[PDB]
Design a protein around this ligand. Sequence first.
Ligand code: FES
Ligand code: FES
Lengths: 523, 523
Amino acid sequence: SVTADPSPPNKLNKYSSRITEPKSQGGSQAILHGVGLSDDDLLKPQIGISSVWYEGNTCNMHLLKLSEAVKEGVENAGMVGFRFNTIGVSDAISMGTRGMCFSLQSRDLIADSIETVMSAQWYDGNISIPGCDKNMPGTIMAMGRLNRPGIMVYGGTIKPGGMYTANTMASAIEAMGMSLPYSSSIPAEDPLKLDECRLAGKYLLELLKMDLKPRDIITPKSLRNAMVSVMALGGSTNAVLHLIAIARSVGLELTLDDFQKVSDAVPFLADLKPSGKYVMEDIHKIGGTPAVLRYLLELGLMDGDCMTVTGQTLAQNLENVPSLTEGQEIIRPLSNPIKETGHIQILRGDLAPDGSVAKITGKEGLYFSGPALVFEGEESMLAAISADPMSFKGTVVVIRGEGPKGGPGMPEMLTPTSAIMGAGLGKECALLTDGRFSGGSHGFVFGHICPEAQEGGPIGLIKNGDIITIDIGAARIDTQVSPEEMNDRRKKWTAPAYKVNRGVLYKYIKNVQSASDGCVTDE
Amino acid sequence: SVTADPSPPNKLNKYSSRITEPKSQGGSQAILHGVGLSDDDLLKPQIGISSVWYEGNTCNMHLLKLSEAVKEGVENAGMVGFRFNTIGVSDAISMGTRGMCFSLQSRDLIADSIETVMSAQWYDGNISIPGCDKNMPGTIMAMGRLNRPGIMVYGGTIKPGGMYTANTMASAIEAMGMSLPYSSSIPAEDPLKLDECRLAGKYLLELLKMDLKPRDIITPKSLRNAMVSVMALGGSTNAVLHLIAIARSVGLELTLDDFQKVSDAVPFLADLKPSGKYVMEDIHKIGGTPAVLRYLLELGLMDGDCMTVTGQTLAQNLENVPSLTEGQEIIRPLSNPIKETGHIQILRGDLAPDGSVAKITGKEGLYFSGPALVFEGEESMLAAISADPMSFKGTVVVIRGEGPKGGPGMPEMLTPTSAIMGAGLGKECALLTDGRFSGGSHGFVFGHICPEAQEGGPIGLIKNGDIITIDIGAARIDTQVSPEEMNDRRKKWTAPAYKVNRGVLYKYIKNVQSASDGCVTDE
Ligand code: FES
Ligand code: FES
């Protein structure tokens, strides 16, 4: 099925032998001697160590230190380590600006970057070190494409001075068996994080011996395990995009309806910010992600037979770990969940026929109806609510043209919800977008609406005054406009000009699939 | 024309003010304090320092040290430096393997990478530090897209224990005014290279004060200056691909015929490997690239009025620099050139209607004719010459399916010429490809043939036995087969399946333009 990267020419150096053994590759051997390899080093496995260090983010500035520890442990395990580094960007910096147009796509750029180096240099395995920014799914996608043994070492969340995207994905990737136990919950710069770094080489050596590859570890069942952790912990709706992209990277299928089925089957149990009170460090103090997953596995919610990067199954990893600390108030018992099903909800209906994603707490009621108030981008919406906030009362606010192609880049938006809260309009309107809304968003806020306006989806045909009725029980975002009149509007509609004609965002427009398809770019 | 990256909201912090000044961006300011910025620091320009450090190549493993020096100089010039790093790959490692399919595209990946970080973080200027691998044009393309003040600090060529792509592009980019004087000729790890690093911030500060941007420096005339250095130094045919890509990045036009015109107008003067005897370090010892360019300008071959990253014109930079050392034998006088015109030749004809590129020394005669010997890739060609070398005598060897889409990745090939040389067949056959042959290639060796075979170009219609006649004076690669019979073949031809269906190379297939178009990917 998936055909992307070179095949190997059992041996632990299945790939690097392509350039270390035949003499026809003497030029390769000469460079390797030049970078410090001895004759005996040429026989060893070669590990690409890919960090996402950069200085403009607290979540990434210390990752070179972690990458050094990883290399030391790779050497202490009898292998050769080759460090390299790719880009990443900070949403806390770019939030509220057109810089956010470059954020989501950097995930796919990172996947391309790591795939490129691993393929060109013939490395046998990968250890990736993403920070607590949001691009780490990119490292897993690269490993799925290559299908060489790999481990993701989460850089760690910063201690306080929330289950946003980074904590959501780190936890989910640990649940999926691609990070070592506790990787997601040990804080950044904790001494145990450095120790994890120094042990990744030992574990990867064993995966090379077993030839336990990413497509042996990432399976329909381990993908479900990842989704279970998202639902139980209240994780971010961005997980829909990222877990779909990860599933596609290994040649598997994952749809919006798979997310609904897991959501319906898993209660929301974790009293964690943004919805709740506690943060990832509090999880760390009561037994960490392994304790949480042990509990979910004991409740029968997880498949324990899935292989992991420990070289053992999830159940074998969790059998021994300390359980959640007696008396802890963070993870609710199954009898008293924060919500009986998951926060993440898939909705269709007239205006989102190919899907949409919401975070529903169960506290906001089942219906909203109002006349549409339509904005062609975040900027006009913010201006209108500044000049005339009362015009928003009772409306269904539509911020369109913010999808993967229309944005471009499917930017995450935070100011619209803040402005609505600040104007006292929180329970008095609903919000629709073909883009995304930040992690503090919940209730009658719907993102990822497909097809996006740029593609002529119904969201692009809404007019001011159209009566929109959102029904959470029926999972529908409907319009009072007749289907015939919306077809009339579709016939008279023409795509707006793209906002760019060059550069990385124009390539994204040329390559990106819909949000319901995880915005994958390589299909 | 070019619309790619965010516009600024005179001030030296034209871009970073978007996030450092507004109270609406308090979250940006909080991260900036978190990474170490004081209140006063928030008023300073912010410089993105993008290195291409990685450990699997001698040409790149020491660039973090250079990046630290660049940051120190940025601070010593009253600005804030933010270091980040992107990927790169080694052709010496991957030569002869399918890993080479990932090499050329990493140029475009690096441009996307640097563009992404600069755009998302709102940096005011860029200092890029590529190594002596081959991807440095990517850094210039990113600067062209952004059109923010920028300087390329060449990492330097390694001292001996050649005018290949890296030296060709470093020299050409210095000639085009986007590197400081001597950047291309100071050896890697020379003390003066570290000093250059520590001065880049001083120079960039002045460019911010003048607002002297990449599109003010990269112009039709400075592009011609770059091409002049390529012809005079005997630089690599790869410069055709990279200078076109750089020209497109600033919204300019540059065609194959432009290269022919400069080639016809500029003699080959430099006795430098691969064609000649000396190496870049020998240039360094007789006055460096500025001394070479000073001579070329005195001969009237260069435009001295072009602005450069010194904040002055090329003529102003070169007026003072020491001239070529008295008695040096490396750079020939104009009266005794190694070749009266440049090595780089554009050829069309029946089999390359959209162009092709050759390195012609003038020592190989004007014609070759022989029956075609056709291979669908490098591997089959190498096998045939191993089993039956005499079957190659007198033929025109065709290695097709090695273009941007067919390869995929337009890999550079070295073993075919080596095998031909080793079999004693060097003057006794010709070589055609839609891919590329390495820098040791010259004479009746023709690359970049367009349209490529994957695209149904005539090269994909050749059959064994077809009489192919190459005429260097007429600049034609012709076939004895009638145009009508070639149309008969085209009508019965169907494109082969792509060799990949996922990953970064499938995206390259989806995005890449022809070699005659510089293999740009963002149009
Ligand atoms: S920017 Fe790193 S997680 Fe918000
Ligand atoms: S690999 Fe760096 S220039 Fe040849």
